[model samples]
Target: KVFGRCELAAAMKRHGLDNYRGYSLGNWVCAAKFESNFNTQATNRNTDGSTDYGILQINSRWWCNDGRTPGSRNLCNIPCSALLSSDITASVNCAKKIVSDGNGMNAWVAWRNRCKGTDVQAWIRGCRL
Candidate 1:
């Protein structure tokens, strides 16, 4: 599923992502924009044989188990495919676990490079959330 900016913001808010870990909904919206363009099925394979899945691009290396990441920890205790679902519940939950692990939003390189230290509120500004 592909979500519009405001739509994804609403969904993220419903899933408790608005200010999870001190990050704003705009921060998450910005991250998803650069990470996956709000596409639920987005996936990217890293040079280390790890794959990132879903909107937040949760990785296989230390999060989900893809059965092919070589040394994946599956700390999220879910199959990598779960992140690709349109429901986004598992994806949201897994992302929270990543943040809870002390990585915060830095777990996503896109967030670090594009959303961090910037006015991310623009990402959610027009949204009526």
Candidate 2:
């Protein structure tokens, strides 16, 4: 299990992601909460015959690879399991790569469907940075 909301903010900030690409801390927390509820072990099967990995739910079809998984391009050059670990290091680096690859936060459906245009401050309300 990863640290809860407030700790996540500090981690993201230390990794240079708090205001990443103009996205606020609340935006990230909200997206993570909806995507995987900050659970580093999160994984979900996608309809594309692939799998999504970790907090951001990045799909194996394009980002991470698992040899048994079909259509895994591994754009992030890491195994799917790497994202499943409780340590945020690998997952956070991979997420930065994803955003830098021109997708920004648009890569996450949670951000688009829930975090966008929504007041996300509640995600970090009582958490101390």
Candidate 3:
């Protein structure tokens, strides 16, 4: 199982952000920490008993589901294994689609800002590639 800096680096690289790009990794780490505490198997249970899973806290049930499953579209529908096996960029791309659709990289930029509570551009300047 991947962990610590190495795993974090791999995950960041998969998302197409420069590994040394200012504070990109730092921001991503912050976001991941907030979302799932870096737990590859983390799952969030909703009031309705539905669940969202994985490191990025993606809800798999919404994307893929078994017709008869109660929480089929809740969040736990997507297996943890699938999320772990998914390319990092795939997850980033999905997030981009949801928040920005085709609005350039604004969504990513916004995400960084929200997660870091700072200027993403400035943070990028600190990145060392």
Candidate 4:
């Protein structure tokens, strides 16, 4: 679910990303099949409980530390197993540089219109360039 077409064509050929077709890989594989169904060691929990690892999920208390907040970034200070490396285009360009700048397919079209409900500009009709 996370990725299929040969691991999303080798993560869009290591990020160079040649013109994605078929409605932009079917809208980024339908938001990676609802975020993590394509399970690259997916994890969740948040709402104060903490934890949010892997596959573009990332949020380990905001990128590691697990001390339970307060500028948390200490889990041996980064290099979290290279963010669960399978190298899916460097974990989806590190969640597409926190969604925007790097523009990982426009953060998979804003995570398929805010977490997969769709209709974000009609699911980005015809897809943007």
Clashing pairs in 4: 1-38, 2-38
For model 2, residues 50-104, the per-residue Cα lDDT tens digits are: 8888776878887878776765788788888988877677777887788898767
Question: Pairing residues by index, what is the TM-score of model 3?
Answer: 0.53
Question: Model 4, 1-129: lDDT tens per residue?
Answer: 345534654464456433332234434444654666566666666787656665656666655554556655533245434556566664555554454344345433336465555543343345443
Off by over 4 Å in 2: none
Clashing pairs in 3: 20-129, 21-127, 22-126, 22-127, 51-75
Q: Could you arrange the candidates by lDDT from highest to lowest?
A: 1, 2, 4, 3
Give the Cα lDDT of each candidate. 0.84, 0.79, 0.49, 0.51
* Deviating ranges (above 4 Å) for candidate 4: 5-9, 16-43, 46-48, 53-56, 62-71, 74-90, 95-129
Worst window of 10 by summed lDDT in candidate 2: 8-17
For 54-118, candidate 1 gives per-residue lDDT tens digits of: 78898888788898877889888888999998886878888888889895677788888777888
Best by TM-score: 1
Candidate 4 accuracy as TM-score: 0.27
Candidate 3 lowest-lDDT run of ten: 101-110
User: Backbone clashes per model, in order?
Assistant: 0, 0, 5, 2
True-structure lDDT of candidate 2? 0.79
Candidate 3 error regions (>4 Å): 17-25, 66-81, 86-93, 99-114, 119-129
